[PDB]
Amino acid sequence: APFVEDWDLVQTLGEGAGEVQLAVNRVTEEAVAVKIVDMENIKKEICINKMLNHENVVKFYGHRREGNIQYLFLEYCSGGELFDRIEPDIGMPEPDAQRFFHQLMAGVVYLHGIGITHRDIKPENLLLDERDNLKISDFGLATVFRYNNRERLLNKMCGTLPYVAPELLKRREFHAEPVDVWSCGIVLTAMLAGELPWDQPSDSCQEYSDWKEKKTYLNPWKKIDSAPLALLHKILVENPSARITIPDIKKDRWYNKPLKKGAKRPRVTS
Numbered sequence: 001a002p003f004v005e006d007w008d009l010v011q012t013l014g015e016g017a018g019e020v021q022l023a024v025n026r027v028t029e030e031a032v033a034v035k036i037v038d039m040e041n042i043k044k045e046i047c048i049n050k051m052l053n054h055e056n057v058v059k060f061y062g063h064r065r066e067g068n069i070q071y072l073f074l075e076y077c078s079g080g081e082l083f084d085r086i087e088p089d090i091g092m093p094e095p096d097a098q099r100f101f102h103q104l105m106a107g108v109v110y111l112h113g114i115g116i117t118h119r120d121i122k123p124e125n126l127l128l129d130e131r132d133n134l135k136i137s138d139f140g141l142a143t144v145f146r147y148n149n150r151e152r153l154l155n156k157m158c159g160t161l162p163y164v165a166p167e168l169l170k171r172r173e174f175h176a177e178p179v180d181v182w183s184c185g186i187v188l189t190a191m192l193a194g195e196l197p198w199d200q201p202s203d204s205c206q207e208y209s210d211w212k213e214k215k216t217y218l219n220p221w222k223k224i225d226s227a228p229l230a231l232l233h234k235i236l237v238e239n240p241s242a243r244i245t246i247p248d249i250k251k252d253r254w255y256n257k258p259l260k261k262g263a264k265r266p267r268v269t270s
């Protein structure tokens, strides 16, 4: 079928690093996101993307290299970033945050299960499809932490300071999985309070010391109900060996609290 390999670049979706363009197929009008990288780091990113196949992870369709430029064909998530669903200083309704948190855990369980750590979990990187299904995106900082059933400890400093686990700032080496668990807890905090608790998790940071001293009568914690706050108390634990694991997050009371009705379906009366 002629022209089916042709895609029109119609809208800029993101910048930094190059750019992410919305691509529309000339024939079928299928929409995909094309990541344009001018163009070792991209080689690893493509290699990790080729491993991925889960409903809460951005789909990787393939890649093409046009000399110095790499084109990554990825899922278009029309709902945009989770970030834009967070109202500043407010957050979002607690049932919406719980549903997004369940979908985030499903994606993180999948990635950890195949031995991949994302390392930069934040609302700017959590995309939403047409049905507001969350998808983990951007595997540019991702790495393999388990291979041939052997865990490799990490030592590379990366991520985004307000979302990073304190062990990345205090220890030479650390386990990969509790780092992603921590960043998910900060995403949950942002979703429920519309604000980030600290600039970074260090003792020099007053808001971080207040949290460790259980001053939950202060913001952002005062805006969060006792059931989700009890989960945050288990996630945002400084010692990564004492921090709750995802299998235990799945047993948490709030995590299992019925709160959100399914999507509004067409109905009539009489």
Ligand SMILES: C[C@H]1CC[C@@H](NCc2ccc3c(c2)Cc2c(-c4ccc(C(=O)O)cc4)n[nH]c2-3)CC1
Pocket (backbone or CB within 6 Å): 012, 013, 014, 020, 033, 035, 058, 074, 075, 076, 077, 078, 079, 080, 081, 127, 137, 138, 139
């Ligand atoms: C609202 C302004 C900001 C960007 C656009 N809307 C938000 C939006 C809407 C849909 C998006 C993205 C962003 C980013 C993106 C991606 C995407 C996929 C994969 C990666 C990656 O692997 O890095 C990055 C981004 N897929 N769909 C979308 C238009 C103007």
